[PDB]
Symmetry: C3
Subunit: 456 residues, 3 copies
Amino acid sequence: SELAARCLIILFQQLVELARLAIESGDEELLRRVSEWLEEVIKDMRRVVEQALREGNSELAARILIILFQQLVELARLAIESGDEELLRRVSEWLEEVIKDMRRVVEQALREGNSELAARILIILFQQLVELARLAIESGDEELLRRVSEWLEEVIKDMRRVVEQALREGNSELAARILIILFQQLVELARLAIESGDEELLRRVSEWLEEVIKDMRRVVEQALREGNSELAARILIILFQQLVELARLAIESGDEELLRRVSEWLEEVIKDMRRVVEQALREGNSELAARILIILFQQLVELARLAIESGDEELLRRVSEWLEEVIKDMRRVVEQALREGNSELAARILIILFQQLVELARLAIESGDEELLRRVSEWLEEVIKDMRRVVEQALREGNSELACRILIILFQQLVELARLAIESGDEELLRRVSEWLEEVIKDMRRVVEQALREGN
Amino acid sequence: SELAARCLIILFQQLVELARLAIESGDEELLRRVSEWLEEVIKDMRRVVEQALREGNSELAARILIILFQQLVELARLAIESGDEELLRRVSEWLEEVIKDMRRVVEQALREGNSELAARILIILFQQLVELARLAIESGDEELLRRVSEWLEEVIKDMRRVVEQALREGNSELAARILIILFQQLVELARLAIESGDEELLRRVSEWLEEVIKDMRRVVEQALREGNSELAARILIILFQQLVELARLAIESGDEELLRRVSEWLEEVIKDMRRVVEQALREGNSELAARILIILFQQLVELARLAIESGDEELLRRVSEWLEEVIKDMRRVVEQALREGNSELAARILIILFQQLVELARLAIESGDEELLRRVSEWLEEVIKDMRRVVEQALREGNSELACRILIILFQQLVELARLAIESGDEELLRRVSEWLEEVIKDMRRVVEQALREGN
Amino acid sequence: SELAARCLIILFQQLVELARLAIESGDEELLRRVSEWLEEVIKDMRRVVEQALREGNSELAARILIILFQQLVELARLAIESGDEELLRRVSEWLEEVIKDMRRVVEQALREGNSELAARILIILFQQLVELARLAIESGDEELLRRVSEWLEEVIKDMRRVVEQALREGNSELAARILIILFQQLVELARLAIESGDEELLRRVSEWLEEVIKDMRRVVEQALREGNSELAARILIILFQQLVELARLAIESGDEELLRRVSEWLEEVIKDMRRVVEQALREGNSELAARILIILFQQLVELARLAIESGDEELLRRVSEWLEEVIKDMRRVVEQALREGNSELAARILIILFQQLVELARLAIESGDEELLRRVSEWLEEVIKDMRRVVEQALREGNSELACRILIILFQQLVELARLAIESGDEELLRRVSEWLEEVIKDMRRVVEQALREGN
């Protein structure tokens, strides 16, 4: 059946190539003959798929339909670009038939206990449908787009059941991967709707996005229940990043309604992530706890940048509040690290945070947002105080090397911040930094004293 | 004697370099002194050659004279370009003396039983003479060209005797190589005559070419008598290629008399090749038989292209008849291959032939030659019918894989041919091809059926 | 103490970077604060240097001060370019303090028996002082330049005592290296004075150069007394090259007074070198003796080129006399080599000399200096006669190969010389060369005869 498939697959491809020649030349008589030949090959291929399924080879069965569908979409593209509605009609009907077959192959795969293949089939199909949707969107074919958007919905429902299956199989990893990929594809489809200005499609997708998010949060819950806080974190981190990417599309397009929905989704993810951080701390994994908050903070600053550049004070407000909450958590993680006797990690957390705060400060300085800059400069001060206590700890631990490294890095970062103040002409910030610089110098000189006393 | 030679060779080169300075500056007094120094060195070198020969080192003796001759020709070039007839005279006399020595070294080599060296000496000398001839031709020095053309004749006669020797030694390989190289050099010389428009030189060369061809055909005969049909084929294949190259020169220059002679030579070679194919088949080597006809057909199509582009219907006619004859032979070789149980080779032959026919068809289509296209399209049909029977054979042999590959390749080639018809707007050809495409599809679907029945 | 140093070094660098921002922006208040911070760090660093010395780590102590000094000079550059005399003042005072420390570290190193480190410290310091001097020279700050030139003098005195120490330790190699490097640095400083037109600085440097030369000549004496004629040669060869480089500066600038002094220094070095050649010959090392004269001759020709291009007949006269003296020595070395049975070396010497003479001849020909060309053409003749006797020797030794090589090379060189005569139109030179060419040819033909008689 393998060879049988290969023959028909190659033939079909060659027929489509011949069809292209007929389409471009405008030879309807040849195109007719070829389109009839294409139909005959499809029927054969579907019987080969049947054979493969009867042989217990659902993998091959899937591959055949996947390739065929791709070729049909390629043929559809030719019809769309040429404006041949009759051919496009025939192909769109062929596409539907293949989809139905593929869904039965997915069913078979699930019955065989192969949820992995089942997922892969639907994931590929969905991607191909979105590609076909793009053709409909760009060409402005609402009838085709309608059909595809309905096909997309059906695939999503199947995928969610495959996610359910994966969870029932105890494979929360796969369950996550499916929803993560789907969400990404939905956002890509959303982008097409946003750029084209198709509010109806965007609506449908935004509803699909919401449904996926809810599923993902339950997968995160599952992961946490399985004692896999690492995966739980990864899921939310990826989701948050994707939400920010979607937010960017809303911000640039000026879609406040979508941005609202996403900003609410972002908030929900943050709350989950903070509970995962809590879990990690309860598990004695302060390292992961730190990494989660560090990544989140970076993503929040990136989102803040979008708000700052666009001039969205309402979003910036929300993010700046989220940033504050993360900072407080991070400082408690630093405390934890110090209590664990890990002054190294404690230092690294504050050093990274400070750098990120200075980066955020730069955005405030360049944009001229004194209110944000104020908040950040206060956050910077708080971090410095913590760092100096970590330096103290390091010295008490007999680690004058680390103590030095912390102050050296901090001083460098302060000078970088000073540069921003100097170039912008912000004497108030420069004053604060120059005072911070002095304090660090005094500490460093005491570390030098310590080093000398240690014979180093 | 080795060092002795090296010293004089280097000195002579340096003297020629000094001569160049005198020539370019126009210092006749210095040039005189150097030309006298050159003469003295030559006399010494000839005595070193004598010594080498007396030492039984004919190899060194040859090398000395070969290098000297090259240096003399380089010096001659300086005289020719500067227009110094007095120097050129002296050098041309020196060249003659060296040639006489070299011919005696060739004699020595032959007496030593070293026909290989003997050949190499004359081959190199001939090449150098042709290079010198080029200088005479471009400068328009008929007196020098005359002398060289006489020297060329003398070398040819020697080479033919070396070929005879090689054949008497049972070395038909060397005999072939000598004539092949000589023929190539003669064609190169012919090109110079053709481009310059020297009919007298071209005449002489064309007569020399004829003589070489006759020798080569006897070497082919020898090779066949030795049971070496492979070499016999290679000789005729190379010769034919060289004849077509010579034909191209005649076609582009518009020399119908030369083209006539070559086209007659081409015919004679074809007849020989077909007998070599017969021999190969009688030896049970259908592979070689196929390769010979495949190469010949390709060369004929290349020659046809020249006729088509130039618009020479008479040549094209002759070639198209030659093409037909080759096709008939190839189909019998396919039959043989099938009878030998080698359906793979049978397929390969027809596949290659079909591709070549389509390439020829392209030439007819682009040129608008409906008569040629007709003939080719009929040839294409005949090949298709054969291929379908080979597919049948393959299926009967239980080789559905090969059966598929044949039809897949054929279909691709038909689509390529269809493209030519579509772009040119030839509905009649497109019709024929589209019918051929349908027939192939039906076959392929039966091969798919077979594959499924085989459990593949 | 290592870490302690690293911390302060990094901090100081960062403070200077911050200072740069203040300087460029013109923020005197920030610059003030930083300059005070810089002072505090310096004081700490000097105590770390003290610690390092107390720990017996004079290496680290040196490294700290060397780095600090470099950073201070970088800061000074910022002050100089910005025109901040107040900052420059503070830095120049800091520079002085560091120098005093470094000199005590040098003292320590010497007391530890580490004259190598002692040298390295002063060498680096001197280089940094010259770099600082350059800044003063280009900016036109005579007050800073004065201070630096006094610092340079002090370092030189120290270095000469380190050279003395090295000699007392039996390390004439290091002693040489120190003076060689110092001299090079002095010439570089001289260049700055010459280009800027600072006769007062140039005077001081030229006096320093003289003092170094005297030391170097005593080191050469030492090396000779140690039986190390190789080192003795290398020292004078390098010195001579450096003197010629200094001469070039004088020639291009047109400073006859400096050129006079250098030309006298060149003469003194030549006399020393000739005595080293004598020594080498007495040691049975004719190879080294040759190499010394060959290099010297090349350097003299290079100096001659400068005289020729500048049109300085007085210098050219002196050099041409020096060239003659070297030639006479070389011919005696050739004699020695022949007496040692080393005809190969004898040949190589004359071959190289002849090539150099032809190169010198080219300069005379292109410049049109018939008097120099005459002298060289006479020198060329003398070398040829020697070479022909070396060829004779080689033949008598049964080495016809070498005999050939000598004449072949000579002939090539004669033709190259002939080319110069031909292009320039010098019939008198061309005549002489053409006669020389004839003589070589006759010799070569006899070598060919010999080779044939040898069966080669």
